[PDB]
Amino acid sequence: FKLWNGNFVFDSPISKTLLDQYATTTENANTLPNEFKFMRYQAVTCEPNQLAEKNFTVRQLKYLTPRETELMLVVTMYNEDHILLGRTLKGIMDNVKYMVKKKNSSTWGPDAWKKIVVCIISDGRSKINERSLALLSSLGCYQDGFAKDEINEKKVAMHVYEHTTMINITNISESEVSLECNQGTVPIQLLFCLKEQNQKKINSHRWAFEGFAELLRPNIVTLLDAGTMPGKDSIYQLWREFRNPNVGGACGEIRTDLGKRFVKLLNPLVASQNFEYKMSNILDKTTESNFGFITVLPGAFSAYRFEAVRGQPLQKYFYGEGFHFFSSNMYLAEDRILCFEVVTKKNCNWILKYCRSSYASTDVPERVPEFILQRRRWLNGSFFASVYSFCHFYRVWSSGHNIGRKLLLTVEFFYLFFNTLISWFSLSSFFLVFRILTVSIALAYHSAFNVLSVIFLWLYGICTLSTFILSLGNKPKSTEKFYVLTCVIFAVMMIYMIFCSIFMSVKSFQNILKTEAFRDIVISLGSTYCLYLISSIIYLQPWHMLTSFIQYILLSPSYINVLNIYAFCNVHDLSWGTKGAMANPLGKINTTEDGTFKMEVLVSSSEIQANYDKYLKVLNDFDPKSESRPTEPSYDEKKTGYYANVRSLVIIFWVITNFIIVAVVLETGGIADYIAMKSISTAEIPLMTSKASIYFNVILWLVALSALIRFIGCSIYMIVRFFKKVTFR
Amino acid sequence: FKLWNGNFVFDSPISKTLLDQYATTTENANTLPNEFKFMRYQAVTCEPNQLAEKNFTVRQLKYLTPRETELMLVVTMYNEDHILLGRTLKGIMDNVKYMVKKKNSSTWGPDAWKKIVVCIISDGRSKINERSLALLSSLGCYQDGFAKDEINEKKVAMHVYEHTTMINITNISESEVSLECNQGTVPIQLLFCLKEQNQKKINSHRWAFEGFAELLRPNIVTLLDAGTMPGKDSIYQLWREFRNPNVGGACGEIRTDLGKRFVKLLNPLVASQNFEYKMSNILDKTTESNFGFITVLPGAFSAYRFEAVRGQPLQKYFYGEGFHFFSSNMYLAEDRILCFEVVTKKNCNWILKYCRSSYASTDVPERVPEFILQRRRWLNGSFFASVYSFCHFYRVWSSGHNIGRKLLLTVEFFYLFFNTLISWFSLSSFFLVFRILTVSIALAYHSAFNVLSVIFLWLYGICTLSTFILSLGNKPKSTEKFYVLTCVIFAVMMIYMIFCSIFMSVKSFQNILKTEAFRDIVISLGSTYCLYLISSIIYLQPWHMLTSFIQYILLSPSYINVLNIYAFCNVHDLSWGTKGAMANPLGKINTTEDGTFKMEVLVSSSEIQANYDKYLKVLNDFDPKSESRPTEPSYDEKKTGYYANVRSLVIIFWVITNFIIVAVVLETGGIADYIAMKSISTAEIPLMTSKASIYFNVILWLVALSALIRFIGCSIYMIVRFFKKVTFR
Numbered sequence A, B: 001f002k003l004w005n006g007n008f009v010f011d012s013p014i015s016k017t018l019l020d021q022y023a024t025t026t027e028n029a030n031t032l033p034n035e036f037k038f039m040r041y042q043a044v045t046c047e048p049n050q051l052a053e054k055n056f057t058v059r060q061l062k063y064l065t066p067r068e069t070e071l072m073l074v075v076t077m078y079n080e081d082h083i084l085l086g087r088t089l090k091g092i093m094d095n096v097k098y099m100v101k102k103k104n105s106s107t108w109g110p111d112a113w114k115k116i117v118v119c120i121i122s123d124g125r126s127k128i129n130e131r132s133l134a135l136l137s138s139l140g141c142y143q144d145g146f147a148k149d150e151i152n153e154k155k156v157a158m159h160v161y162e163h164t165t166m167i168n169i170t171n172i173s174e175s176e177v178s179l180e181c182n183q184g185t186v187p188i189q190l191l192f193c194l195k196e197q198n199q200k201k202i203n204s205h206r207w208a209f210e211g212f213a214e215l216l217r218p219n220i221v222t223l224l225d226a227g228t229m230p231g232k233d234s235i236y237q238l239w240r241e242f243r244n245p246n247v248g249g250a251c252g253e254i255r256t257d258l259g260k261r262f263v264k265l266l267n268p269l270v271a272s273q274n275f276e277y278k279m280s281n282i283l284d285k286t287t288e289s290n291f292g293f294i295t296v297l298p299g300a301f302s303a304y305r306f307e308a309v310r311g312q313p314l315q316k317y318f319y320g321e322g323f324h325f326f327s328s329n330m331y332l333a334e335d336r337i338l339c340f341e342v343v344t345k346k347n348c349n350w351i352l353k354y355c356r357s358s359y360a361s362t363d364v365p366e367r368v369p370e371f372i373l374q375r376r377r378w379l380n381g382s383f384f385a386s387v388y389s390f391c392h393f394y395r396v397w398s399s400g401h402n403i404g405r406k407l408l409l410t411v412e413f414f415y416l417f418f419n420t421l422i423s424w425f426s427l428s429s430f431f432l433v434f435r436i437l438t439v440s441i442a443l444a445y446h447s448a449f450n451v452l453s454v455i456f457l458w459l460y461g462i463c464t465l466s467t468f469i470l471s472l473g474n475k476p477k478s479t480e481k482f483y484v485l486t487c488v489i490f491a492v493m494m495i496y497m498i499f500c501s502i503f504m505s506v507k508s509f510q511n512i513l514k515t516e517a518f519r520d521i522v523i524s525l526g527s528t529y530c531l532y533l534i535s536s537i538i539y540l541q542p543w544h545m546l547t548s549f550i551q552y553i554l555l556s557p558s559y560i561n562v563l564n565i566y567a568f569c570n571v572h573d574l575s576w577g578t579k580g581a582m583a584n585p586l587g588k589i590n591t592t593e594d595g596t597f598k599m600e601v602l603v604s605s606s607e608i609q610a611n612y613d614k615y616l617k618v619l620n621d622f623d624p625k626s627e628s629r630p631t632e633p634s635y636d637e638k639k640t641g642y643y644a645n646v647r648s649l650v651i652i653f654w655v656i657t658n659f660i661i662v663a664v665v666l667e668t669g670g671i672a673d674y675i676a677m678k679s680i681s682t683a684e685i686p687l688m689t690s691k692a693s694i695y696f697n698v699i700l701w702l703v704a705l706s707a708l709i710r711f712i713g714c715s716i717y718m719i720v721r722f723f724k725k726v727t728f729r
Ligand SMILES: CCCCCC/C=C\CCCCCCCC(=O)O[C@H](COC(=O)CCCCCCCCCCCCCCC)COP(=O)(O)OCCN
Pocket: A655, A656, A659, A668, A669, A670, A673, B427, B428, B431, B435, B457, B458, B459, B460, B461, B462, B464, B465, B468, B655, B658, B659, B662, B666, B667, B668, B672, B685, B686, B687
């Protein structure tokens, strides 16, 4: 044929079956648009930022009247099953169908499907699941055969398939994705585009933001994820938060998919994540949404105003600039740098909201090795984005916000830093609460609490040493049975700690009715748990405070110890130099039956003598003093050596600063020996001092203060939403 | 031309200059043998064990009367300078020249050079230093041009050059290797053979033992390293130990090359290694030689009787057999498995001798990162060979030794295991000696020794934590300035420890003349240092007890802590799975000026419909219950996961067992708290207990007992040698 100005663009038909199905939808089979009968394949052979320059287009811009996209739903996928992708697509099509049935809308209506463009971006053709390709092909958005690797000695970077389908998923069973095309389906503009090389997930967003977003010029860019099924109208509810111009990015609630009839609650790891997510979306997102800066907008379900992110925010997201600390480690916070650069944008008053009435059930890990590896990225990004946000807090005052909002933002950044400092010292805080609570009960009532205080300290020491060693030089999949054992041991430690607290609390009552432990029950059961329960109730979602709350408590020591140790030990995912330099090729010999071969060799006396003199002048012009500089590292081998140095100086600084607090409260590290020796000069060490009780009270009142601030934030969020509801009635 | 039975063999001439030089040597230029005028190049394209089978030969077997090789000197080299190789070659040619001038010999004489075959084996052609190639080419054993990469679609495994040279090195300056050919030179049968691929060092010995040793059938095989210059007659003295049939392997003294006028003694790291080597060859080699089993025969200078190692010992050395502990990890002890399998050989009474009068100065690391990486292999091999030797000690009694020697060997194995147990607990032993000595001086005399006991404990804790973290997840070359700082800090700790010992020793004397510390001076200065001095003196080599003995003491804490921590943290040199699976190739498009290209595409309704149904039956026959088993690891990624599990279970077991002793002597780990709490039940902790003094005395009397056993062994060795000297007068 002929290509489209240096671009391979083939406009092929779909199939007889799909055409018949689509024709059943319309009242007249003759009047079927030109978008449902074809599937335009393009071979993009350039960078995403050069898409418009290299004359690559999409089908939305080639209509007689160009379509103005209002939502660009972006579904990043990689090796996900057809059930995970089908679950995400069913939510999108339910949202589009809901957004078409609306009547009292100035944006949505009978022709609302032309404003949404669904853009599935798979990460590598070699890694995509064949069942996912089968599902996309059954939707009319993928045909086998047109996947050319190279176009005019230019490698193809992406294969872009686009087809406005009429097929909608209507049911996702455990093994079946039901695809009906009746009179009650809506068209979906599919733009499934899969890469050739697996260039991670940030590059998928680079393709969706610097690439197709530039051509589409959408208003909002909702970033879904493969496996994350939004609600019946959650994307529409998330889009409703952009009615006021100030919002330049919003996020919804992400729930946990508990399976058929809540079957996954039996898994203690899934139930713990359920409660953690519910608390994150009741106390963290609601509190941060009041100030106007949400720490992370989840990549699984979030929406950005395109105008808000275009420019400096996306510039630091993708490139972000030597080996400097804030420029070489900025990639740890993948999409958390996109939230800080939008709120703190020069001459722009952007804020981030959290939509309570827009949910999206996701798929969470069910196994410890898969759960630990996920939270390493989460913890590393959250730590590196909090350090970046606090250090660059002066950029709030260089933005276009008013003074009233700037003050709230700088108050929130201090609170976020205080939370970061609490989470940094959690390794020492848990050990000190455990060690003070199990020693102060062995002094008060002795009996078997004596040897139990030594058994559980040694068990802690062994489980923490082994976690440090298995995290620095071993993989979680290598040792799955030990990480589960460590989680079980820390759960036993938490059970013992709770028992000790209840015992010393009931004994204090029976001593008064017939102190550090007297106010220990109005600090962690009445001021902390009751506030969580009330916050969950006022959120109108209290059913997780009993279904999945014990598994969270029993697994919290694993969150503090196993999870943070592994996150801090694998900061940078090192690989070390692996090049394998190759020598210059030499000649070839291919003998015959008798073995005679060509003669092109050197036998001449002069020719041999010249080589001998060449090897004789090398020995004669060595010149040791002017020794050539030893070959210095490359960049990938020099850059790994810096990531290793940053990684190790973080573990050392995090272990030493946590131990300094343990060395001050419990007087370990020779501190007690030194104090006793001074008294000798002017010979015994006390077991428990007065610093231990003061620290215990302080570290359990900080937990109550954080819960109280989070409760106040949640209440303010709910009250403001209720007032915006009573005024829009 | 024509090849030699499927083998590329070219018999080229050398050069006009070399022929003239050789002709100057002979009285008549016409009567020059055929071996000095040619250089037979061969292209070996097979495994070393198939060398004879695939009709590959050497020049000694093609004479009219085949030459019987008596010594096969094997010089393994890899990327070494031309000075390092020239230094090794000068010693070999001095030895050959010494072995020709002998007259009262039934093996050596005017034609003794026909029995020695020097076999240089370089490890990779891409890595060999071009100046080393220049030096070999100037010796007439390498010509550029004949290095074919493949012979009849069969990759060339080695390029074998062989030429009996007449050129001898007579002086090695800092940058010049003097090559004269006068009337006082001896021929050297060179067999320089370099590989194509860098297959490590064990494969070089596989080529030298299963390969050219099979063809040559030598009596002795001396293993040198490029850079190790033997003495004027050290190889002859080493060969002289094989006169008695019992010896099936011998080794000489390895010294340190201190440079021109002992310039390298300024380096404290070189001076420390000097003393360590001196003591190793005065107290370890001499003591072990009496029993008849030397723990390691150094790869830099050792000799094996060919018939002694030929068979089961070499089979274990090279292949040595699942993931079993003694079969998967036995490669850690590279050549230490060759020593144990020779002494404990079925129906063979082989013993290993140590030759005092055969030395070889070597090149030692001058920088901390290079010194740490070398000693990792040494420590790991010595630990894995001691565990193997002790566990398989029953194989001594299944060998052909007599009962008297079997009893001596089983007595030696228990002593070697006791030394291994001491070196395993050195991490705790040093800390306990340091902590007991700096606390017991702060109680006795207070003053500034109080805060110094806490500063130095915290300094130790920081330097040990940082060494553990920098060893598990960082490379020594990445952090060179920190390892030097850690060595300096441990040297300061040793200076303080020595000061504390001297202080408390002089105070005890001034208290008695006007106890754990009273006998502290007759345990570590009179029973340990005096025995070292006397052993060095009776060895007739005492000059290192003063030149390089302070730098050894100041660097011993680094040997105990930095060196062992790094060795135990990097047991297996992991790399983790790095494969990068590739997808199937797709089509190609090459457009023309107008962009028209060939049409071989699918447009047919049936052909598209068949693909659509193919992607519709994949979505229809998912069958989740009969789910395909998840793709299990390969072998290189499954074998790394086992080396990681063995590596981590060694660090955990080595840290926990060392801390148990610290938890028993100092009562840390809640032991003191638990002891005080029992007294509460029937409230203060003592600073120093009576267990600390008992352990201090025990751990400093074990040091004296080991030194006494080593002194007795050295004295017996010297006395036996003196009696063998007075009888052979
Ligand atoms: C020999 C075994 C080696 C094991 C190595 C494990 C891996 C990494 C490095 C660990 C560094 C500490 C090594 C062991 C030191 C030790 O067992 O020493 C003890 C405990 O001392 C304490 O407090 C210990 C407190 C816990 C330390 C946590 C890890 C290190 C964090 C940073 C360290 C900073 C400096 C710490 C200095 C101690 C001194 O007990 P004592 O004689 O005072 O008891 C008097 C009772 N009446």
